[PDB]
Design a protein around this nucleic acid. Structure first.
Ligand code: 118
Ligand code: MG
Ligand code: ZN
Ligand code: ZN
Lengths: 1338, 465, 49
DNA sequence: GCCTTGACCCTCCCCTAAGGGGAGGGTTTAGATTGTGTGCAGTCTGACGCGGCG
């Protein structure tokens, strides 16, 4: 057993202590007798014997002597398995550089020595010298030279200085430096130069030096002098059938190293010239680099078939490395697969399994059972009995599979309902039989799909397959709490045909005694299923304490509903079957049956519904013919009446009355209108066109047309497809996105042209090609979500906070899109909310809001509840059960030990394949309410407001907000506040291409703040004669003029600036360029007059950008702190802006380009967070200025905006889990005796539990800021290197973990999957807990 | 330098040298030759501790007359026995000695390039000279631990005087307390210095004449080395022009170049300018030899010996011309009839010329399925066989309990069941002191009972193998 | 694709200003590639392979 | 049954006289010759981080 995993650098002595001897030559094996040659790469004296308990010569054998070492051949007598464990080594004749610690950016050598990469890569190729010692001279350490300057220094200084070349120089540099002294001298000499640009690199270098000092490594071990050699059985040399051999590539890469090292050991004995020894050292360096990482430092060495050779680093990383191919998913025994087909007679817990598959998968069970009954003497006779297929084998098989579940699985597995457990029923034939009700969780059908079969072997696996995964526990969805077993295609059609009615049906009028008599009359041929009758019916209810009370009546109904009522269980009202049922009504039936009665009645009721639907669909006789597609008789005239209009709109273009663009854009809509007319004529001629007469004469009723019947019931189809069957097809797009002019005026019942067919193929291929190239983006997103969320598990029962989040309905974009009931069902209340009076307590203030509480909330009217959330949980390393709420697939409080992260990721990722990739009116009557407002009366008897960010709400009968808008700034409110206005009434009027900005108070306007020669012209409208000093563009700019940006201001009878009530305010605002102002000089105005005006992607990409926390390319600018705004020093790179607190310091001022139109004038007072411009907001700013709840709310609303637009239902805590995982890091601002640095990035939980102990015994803690990382940057920044290494970028993760000296504690799920242990979630949660208790014991 | 290619980095550092003319190589070879004889001169008058040729001419005891081979060795020693009689006169550096031993050098200059014979005489002093060096290192690792003292007076007068320890009297002369701060250890200095003085006894000569003329003997061994270096460095384009016709045969370009350079370094060592030929004509042989020898030794995963390489090459050359002549490929019969070898050997050769396939070879339409995925482990035992082995062990253990304990111990010892080894009759009767024959008797008893049908049909169930 | 010369442009997507940038390529059956291009400041450039 | 003789018997390895045949390893070879070469591959798009130059 073990508890952790470590990683570090390896010294030469460590590499020599792993090995069993030195490899000295490239010999692999002998060419006549294929035996391993001595001292080569497959040597049997170093690496172990090639047969069990035999030496190589043949002298020793037979397991008598087990530890002897033969004296002839040196092989020891032992088992050959040891050729997978023993290593060797190679002693290099000159040191070489490890390529990982040199060329993985940032380089660790260049960061440790503070040298550029160019200088090092020049000293390493014998191309320049480097000074190691200065002696007493002008030259200093790490100075770079050339040959001539080296000769000059030699003949001038002589012996005192020291200069070298190659990896020996760099090893001497790394070996001589002192780390503690250097880091401490980086400490006190940073505070002066703690400027940011130097701050980042200085603190990075400081933490690197400190890591080397504390970890125990030495900086010179990054230069190799001894090399290890992998065991032979992991790089084998193997014969094929035919005498041919096959080999690994590491052999090819090791031979080059060995026989370039031997040549250098020769040249160093012949005492050759240095121009040749240098070439050898370069070649040795290149060979070792290609053995470690092939294509990194140059061209890739290729083999004799012109493909690059694979290296030690390509066997670990990538989609086909060890991690993703052999450790996170494997191939398994006891498994099979086959084609699936439907069996409609099965129960919900049953599957049909062929006899031959089951005989193969269950062989050891059958052998043991056979030799227990004495039917066979030994296992080898049992084998032949089974192989002959005697008759008793088939009777042993039937009692082996009795009460043995079997797991079925279909790929791709998008969520956990892709694997389910069944009980097998032996069949003849070769295809597997599946129940018709589970094909919706699998996404399966019978056009050729195939499924896989797995057999659990042990007692615990059988218990878990029965209790957790059996198909009769999985009726609800885990994403939303809805049922998943709804009936799809012919259950629906049969139940809909049996509960319809008809006029003048045979047997109309009778009075019957009960359902049994209606059935007996239908079977006999006396009544019809659609006949209107009167039946006596008994129904039950429960208002007693768990008991049922009955009551009988006479009801008016049809025969078919009375027949169906014999299926419904006791305790449901009759009004559920008295409709004409469709898919929605049947789903309602199943859901109310689950809410009232429970699980087992529901799983019996679903089966009964399926059987009776199939039976009556069969008896109906529904078919499809060519006459069932009815084309309306007035299409041929709508078409001509559109063609005449397009002709008479072409001839207004041939005579120069209309442009080409408007001509096209008018033909488009005069064809769209005719298409809509045709479609509505078609649909009205088809839907109720039945004239069936009655006892005296004719009347109308709904149609019994087959196509209409299967479209209207929800079995198969829609209106958009009958439109193409019987209407016209419509308008087609080019592959560009442009729409062709002439539409397709034909349908499929009539037949297309060559040309209409040709132009219809474009969109078909475009859709088919988008599907295949979207599935990859969806899968990659799911994998990143699973990797960020995998280690989050419900750990505790109650953390005890009072925090929460405020849930209200969403009413924007129109009507109420999401009620309050759908957003609090299941959550736990954060505070003791009270119905809209005072002290209307419903709560112990921890209350699981089940359906009765939601009904109580809706019989009153409350529209805001404070609830609990995971992004505010106080538990570290997990969540508590009360902050999470309800288990959405079980219907009760979540259990402690549940893996909520994998469920969140799977629920968000599964639907990703369906994503696409001038005046205010009021509807209904209610009060009008305003917020965030500041008002003034107008000159024309109306309301105006001087607020930019106000909100206008509509109040209902009881005071629940039904609609909410916001008005543009400067707009004039047509009517005031507190009004009960009816619908159809406008409340505010704004211009569609303009917005005015108004004065403050009635005063006297003066033309000031502008001269002639300024950004002002004297441009007067020559035809009408109205002009103020008008503000200009930058094309008419006079740079010397913009000394003061023009604005016409308001003065008193004093000639000076007007009072503003409440504060000594300047009454007038200076406006940016190109302003339209035509207000007269000398013609004064009143308060609120027109002084100036303002002239003027969804799908998977947006979801990925939200979770990755991208930054928009036009981000809005917000107020850093609260203060009075003004323009700053005006350094004209581009504009400068400052704000000033009324009490505090104001060193903060920064840059704004003049393209960015400002909406805050020099007299404004802003609070923290409000906008200074418009544009999409950036989430890091929302987290810095406003808190955590603001960025949570923004992210969840912007994500749900995309899913709701398509009809996809996902609960909202599944996004809160991801948002919690993106917020795990904190950054330190002021340490204060906290053992942390001053701008280091730490885990948030470490800071929290450090400050909770410092503050415990009376000390000052640390101060910090929160951070927001994307999902792939937060997956890689976790504190376990095995999860990060197995996710992505294995090279960077492993080099950084190696030089840092990290360790791993195996706390997530993936760490325990890699080493084959029980995960800490589920039925394995208790086990780990007990182990953790022993961690406190020792 | 804006490049990382090592072939360009080589061809650039190689181009800063100039090609030689016919006179340049001759007068370079001349100084190569005369430095190596300046050395042999310097070796002449060293004392008898050298391995001097007194009887090397007798140690060994173009076909030269025996009377010529016996006589001309008598000139040199006939003068030498009377010349070095003056080893005593006026110390060791007498001028008649220099004059007539450089006249022995006038005699010595006649000779030219020779095998390591000459080497093994200068090694005669190697094993003796560095010895002297290392011994005066010993004294130093015995002085610095006890006292510190300025080295450039001590070792200077050490180089100079070498008469006796009287130069230590030059240490107290400056009157500083580091003079005799040494205590009780100077006899270790005298230990090592006295042992090197008995080395001086066996040599009979002081060190500052031996090392004196070793300073000038080292001049020759370096002046030959430098000229060899610049004779090598001026001909690298020859190697590069030869080695470009061996590409695509299992080695890379720079490997062929670095193999050719080791042959050029031998052609430079064996040259003789007197024979009148150019350097290219003699060097090309050694260059091609080195490259050809390295292609046949490396460049195959499974290595083939040289004779098999030449057999393969000859068979290829024959089949080429038979294919050109017949228009088809010849069967091994038509190759055996012309190669004149037994047909079974022609069949044996044709299997040895195949290189192993890579385990990354893409097999299918895609490139995610490789050859190495479908390779099965063949050394594993099936679980039916494991279960059978264990069941048979249990069955035998049950049948071995019926008969006597002493009569089953002998079967356990005889077949090795439950024991570390099998045994023989005499070593089993060792512990039973039973005769050679009674063991066989009781074994024919046990094996006769164990096949009686009351017992056998439990074990018979297994023998259907 | 046929050999010959092909004139193309990136349509206001490479540069932030929204300017289109033109280029021309010569492509042989066998040989090396030669192409000219424009840049934001209206200077012709050339490159080989 | 509980042991002791004296005969018999088997297989496995090494040996004879005067070389023969082969496998696997070493060494030199003297007219001159002095800078690669494939009729290469070059071929995607988007986001991010850091250095080098104005
Ligand atoms: C092709 C090209 C050259 C040689 Sb030759 C050689 C071969 C047989 C007899 C005489 C010469 C050679 C020399 C040493 C090592 C390998 C091959 C050879 C040598 C120098 C000049 C010209 C040819 C052989 C085949
Ligand atoms: Mg299918
Ligand atoms: Zn052995
Ligand atoms: Zn909590």
């Amino acid at each position: 057993e073990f508890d952790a995993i470590k990683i570090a650098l390896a010294s030469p002595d460590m590499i020599r202590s792993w090995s069993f001897g030195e490899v000295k030559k490239p010999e692999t094996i002998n060419y006549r007798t294929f035996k391993p040659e001595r001292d080569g790469l497959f040597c049997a004296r170093i690496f172990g014997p090639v047969k069990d308990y035999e030496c190589l010569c043949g002298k020793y054998k037979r397991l008598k002597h087990r530890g002897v070492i033969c004296e002839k051949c040196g092989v020891e007598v032992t088992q050959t398995k040891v050729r997978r464990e023993r290593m060797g080594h190679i002693e290099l004749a000159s040191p070489t550089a490890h390529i990982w610690f040199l060329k993985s950016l940032p380089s660790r050598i260049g960061l440790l020595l503070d040298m550029p990469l160019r200088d090092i890569e020049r000293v390493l190729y014998f191309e320049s010298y480097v000074v190691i010692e200065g002696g007493m001279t002008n030259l200093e350490r790490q100075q770079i030279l050339t040959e001539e300057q080296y000769l000059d220094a030699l003949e001038e200084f002589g012996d005192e200085f020291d200069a070298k070349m190659g990896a020996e120089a760099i090893q001497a540099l790394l070996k001589s430096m002192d780390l503690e002294q250097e880091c401490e001298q980086l400490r006190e000499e940073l505070n002066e130069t703690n400027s940011e640009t130097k701050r980042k690199k200085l603190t990075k270098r400081i933490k690197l030096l400190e890591a080397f000092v504390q970890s125990g490594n030495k900086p010179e071990w990054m230069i190799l002098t001894v090399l290890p050699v992998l065991p032979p059985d992991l790089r084998p040399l193997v014969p094929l059938d035919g005498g041919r051999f096959a080999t690994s590539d590491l052999n090819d890469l090791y031979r080059r190293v060995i026989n370039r090292n031997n040549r250098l050991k020769r040249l160093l004995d012949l005492a050759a010239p240095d121009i040749i020894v240098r070439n050898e050292k370069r070649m040795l360096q290149e060979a070792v680099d290609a053995l470690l990482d092939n294509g990194r430092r140059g061209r890739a060495i290729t083999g004799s078939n012109k493909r690059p050779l694979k290296s030690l680093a390509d066997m670990i990383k990538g989609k086909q490395g060890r991690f993703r191919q052999n450790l996170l998913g494997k191939r398994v025994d006891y498994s099979g697969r086959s084609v699936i087909t439907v069996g409609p007679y099965l129960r919900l817990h049953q599957c049909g399994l062929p006899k031959k598959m089951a005989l193969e998968l269950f062989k050891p069970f059958i052998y043991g059972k056979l030799e227990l009954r004495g039917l066979a003497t030994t296992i080898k006779a049992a084998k032949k009995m089974v192989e002959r297929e005697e008759a008793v084998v088939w009777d042993i098989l039937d009692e082996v599979i009795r009460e043995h579940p079997v797991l079925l699985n279909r790929a791709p597995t998008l969520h956990r309902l892709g694997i389910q457990a069944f009980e097998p029923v032996l069949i003849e034939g070769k295809a597997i039989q599946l129940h018709p009700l589970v094909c919706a969780a699998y996404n399966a059908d019978f056009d050729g799909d195939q499924m896989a079969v797995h057999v659990p072997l042990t007692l615990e696996a059988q218990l878990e397959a029965r209790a957790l995964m059996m198909s009769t526990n999985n009726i609800l969805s885990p994403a939303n709490g809805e049922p998943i077993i709804v009936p799809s295609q012919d259950v629906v059609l049969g139940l809909y045909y049996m509960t319809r009615d008809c006029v003048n049906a045979k047997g109309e009028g009778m009075v019957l005694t009960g359902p049994k008599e209606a059935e007996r009359l239908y079977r006999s041929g006396l009544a019809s299923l659609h006949a209107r009758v009167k039946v006596r019916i008994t129904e039950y209810e429960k208002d007693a304490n768990g008991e049922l009370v009955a009551k009988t009546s006479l009801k008016d109904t049809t025969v078919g509903r009375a027949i169906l009522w014999m299926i419904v269980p006791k305790g449901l009202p009759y009004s559920i079957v008295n409709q004409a049922l469709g898919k929605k009504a049947i789903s309602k039936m199943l859901n109310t049956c689950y809410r009232i009665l429970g699980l087992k009645p529901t799983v019996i009721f679903a089966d009964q519904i399926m059987y009776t639907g199939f039976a009556y669909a069969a008896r109906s006789g529904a078919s499809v013919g060519i006459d069932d597609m009815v084309i309306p008789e007035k299409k041929h005239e709508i078409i001509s009446e559109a063609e005449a209009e397009v002709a008479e709109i072409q001839e207004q273009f041939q005579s120069g009355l209309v442009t080409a663009g408007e001509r096209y854009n008018k033909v488009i809509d005069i064809w769209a209108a005719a298409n809509d007319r045709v479609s509505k004529a078609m649909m009205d001629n088809l839907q109720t066109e039945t004239v069936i007469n009655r006892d005296g004469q004719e009347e109308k009723q709904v149609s019994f047309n087959s196509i209409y019947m299967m479209a209207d019931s929800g079995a198969r189809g829609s209106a958009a497809q009958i439109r193409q069957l019987a209407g016209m097809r419509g308008l087609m797009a080019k592959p560009d996105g442009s729409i062709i002019e002439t539409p397709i005026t034909a349908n499929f019942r009539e037949g297309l042209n060559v040309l209409q067919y040709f132009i219809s193929t474009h969109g078909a291929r475009k859709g088919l090609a988008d599907t295949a190239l979207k599935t990859a983006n969806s899968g990659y997103l799911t994998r990143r979500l699973v990797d960020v969320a995998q280690d989050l598990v419900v750990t505790e029962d109650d953390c005890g906070t009072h925090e929460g989040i405020m849930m209200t309905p969403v009413i924007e974009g129109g009507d109420v899109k999401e009620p309050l009931r759908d957003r609090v069902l299941g959550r736990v209340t954060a505070e003791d909310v009270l119905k809209p009076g005072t002290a209307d307590i419903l709560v112990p203030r921890n209350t699981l809001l089940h359906e009765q509480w939601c009904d109580l909330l809706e019989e009153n009217s409350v529209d805001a509840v404070k609830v609990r959330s995971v992004v505010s949980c106080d538990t570290d390393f997990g969540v508590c059960a009360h902050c999470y709420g309800r288990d959405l697939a079980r219907g009760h409080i979540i259990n402690k030990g549940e893996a909520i992260g994998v469920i969140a990721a799977q629920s968000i990722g599964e639907p990703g394949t369906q994503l696409t990739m001038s005046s205010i009116q009021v509807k209904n009557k209610g009060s009008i309410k305003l917020s965030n407002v500041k008002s003034v009366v107008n000159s024309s008897g109306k309301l105006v407001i001087t607020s930019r960010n106000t909100e206008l709400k509509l109040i209902d009968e009881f005071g629940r907000t039904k609609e909410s808008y916001k008005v543009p700034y400067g707009a004039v409110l047509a009517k005031g506040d507190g009004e009960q206005v009816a619908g159809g009434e406008t409340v505010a009027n704004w211009d569609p291409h303009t917005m005015p900005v108004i004065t403050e108070v009635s005063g006297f306007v003066r033309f000031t703040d502008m001269i002639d020669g300024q950004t002002i012209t004297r441009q007067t409208d020559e035809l009408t004669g109205l002009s103020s000093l008008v503000v200009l563009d930058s094309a008419e700019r006079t740079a010397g003029g913009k000394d003061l940006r023009p604005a016409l201001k308001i003065v008193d009878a004093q000639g000076n600036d007007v009072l503003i009530p409440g504060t000594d305010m300047p009454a007038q605002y200076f406006l940016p360029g190109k302003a339209i102002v035509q207000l007269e000089d000398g013609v004064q105005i009143s308060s609120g007059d027109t002084l100036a005006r303002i002239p003027q992607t969804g799908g998977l990409p947006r979801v990925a950008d939200l979770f990755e926390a991208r930054r928009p390319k036009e981000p809005a600018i917000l107020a850093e702190i609260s203060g009075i705004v003004s323009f700053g020093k005006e350094t004209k790179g581009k504009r400068r802006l400052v704000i000033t607190p009324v009490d505090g310091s104001d060193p903060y001022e920064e840059m704004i380009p003049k393209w960015r139109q400002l909406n805050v004038f020099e007299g404004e007072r802003v609070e923290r967070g409000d906008v200074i411009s418009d544009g999409p907001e950036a989430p890091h700013d929302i987290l810095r200025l406003r808190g955590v709840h603001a960025v949570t709310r923004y992210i969840v609303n912007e994500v749900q905006d995309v899913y709701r637009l398509q009809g996809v239902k996902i609960n909202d805590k599944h996004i809160e889990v991801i948002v919690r995982q993106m917020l795990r890091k904190a950054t330190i601002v002021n340490a204060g005796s906290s053992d942390f640095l001053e701008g280091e990035q730490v885990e948030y939980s470490r800071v929290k539990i450090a400050n909770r102990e410092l503050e415990a015994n009376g000390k000052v803690g640390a101060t910090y800021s929160r951070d927001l990382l994307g999902i792939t940057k937060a997956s890689l920044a976790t504190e376990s290197f095995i999860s990060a290494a197995s996710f992505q970028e294995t090279t960077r993760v492993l080099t950084e973990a190696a030089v840092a000296g990290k360790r791993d504690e195996l706390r997530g799920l993936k760490e325990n999957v890699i080493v084959g242990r029980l995960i800490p979630a589920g039925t394995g949660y208790a086990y780990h807990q007990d182990r953790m208790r022993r961690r406190a014991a020792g | 330098g804006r490049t990382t290619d090592p072939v360009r980095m080589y061809m650039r550092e190689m181009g800063t040298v100039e090609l030689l003319t016919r006179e340049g190589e001759i007068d370079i070879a001349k100084r190569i030759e005369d430095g190596i004889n300046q050395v042999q001169c310097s070796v002449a008058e060293y004392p008898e501790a050298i391995t001097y040729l007194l009887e090397q001419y007798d140690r060994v005891e173009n076909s030269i007359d025996p009377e010529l081979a016996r006589e001309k060795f008598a000139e040199l020693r006939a003068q030498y026995v009377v010349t070095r009689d003056t080893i005593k006169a006026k110390g060791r550096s007498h001028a008649t000695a220099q004059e007539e031993i450089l006249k022995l050098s006038e005699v010595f200059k006649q000779f030219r390039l020779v095998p390591k014979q000459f080497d093994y005489l200068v090694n005669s002093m190697r094993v003796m000279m560095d010895r002297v060096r290392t011994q005066e290192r010993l004294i130093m690792k015995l002085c610095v631990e006890q006292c510190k003292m300025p080295k450039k007076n001590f070792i200077t007068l050490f180089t100079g005087n070498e008469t006796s320890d009287t130069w230590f009297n030059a240490a107290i002369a400056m009157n500083k307390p580091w003079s005799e701060k040494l205590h009780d250890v100077s006899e270790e200095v005298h230990r090592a210095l006295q042992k090197l003085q008995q080395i001086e006894e066996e040599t009979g000569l002081t060190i500052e004449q031996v090392k004196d003329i070793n300073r000038r003997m080292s001049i020759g061994e370096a002046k030959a080395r430098r000229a060899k270096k610049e004779m090598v460095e001026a001909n690298l384009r020859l190697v590069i022009s030869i080695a470009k016709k061996y590409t695509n045969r299992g080695l890379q370009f720079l490997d062929l170049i670095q193999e050719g350079n080791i042959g050029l370094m031998k052609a430079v060592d064996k040259f003789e300018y007197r024979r009148g030929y150019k350097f290219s004509t003699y060097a090309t042989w050694w260059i091609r030899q080195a490259i050809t020898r390295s292609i046949a030794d490396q460049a195959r995963t499974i290595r083939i010996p040289v004779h098999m390489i030449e057999t393969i090459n000859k068979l290829n050359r024959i089949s080429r011309q038979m294919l050109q002549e017949m228009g088809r490929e010849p069967t091994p019969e038509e190759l055996a009839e012309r190669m004149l070898m037994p047909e079974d050997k022609i069949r044996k050769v044709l299997k040895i010329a195949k290189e192993p396939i890579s385990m990354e070879t893409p097999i299918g339409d895609d490139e995610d399925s490789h050859l190495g995925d479908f390779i099965e482990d063949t050394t594993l035992e099936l679980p039916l066989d494991s279960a059978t082995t264990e069941s048979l062990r249990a069955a035998t253990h049950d049948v071995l309990a019926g008969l006597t304990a002493r009569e089953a111990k002998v079967l356990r010892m005889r077949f090795g069941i439950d024991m570390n080894t099998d045994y023989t009759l005499e070593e089993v009767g060792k512990q039973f002191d039973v005769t050679r024959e009674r063991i066989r008797q009781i074994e024919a008893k046990a094996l006769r009972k164990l096949r009686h049908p009351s017992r056998s049909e439990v074990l018979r169930s297994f023998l259907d193998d | 694709r046929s050999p010959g010369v092909f004139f193309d442009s990136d349509k206001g997507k490479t540069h932030s200003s929204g300017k289109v940038l033109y280029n021309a390529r010569i492509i042989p059956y066998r040989g090396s590639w030669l192409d000219f291009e424009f840049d934001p400041k209206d200077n012709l450039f050339v490159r080989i392979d």
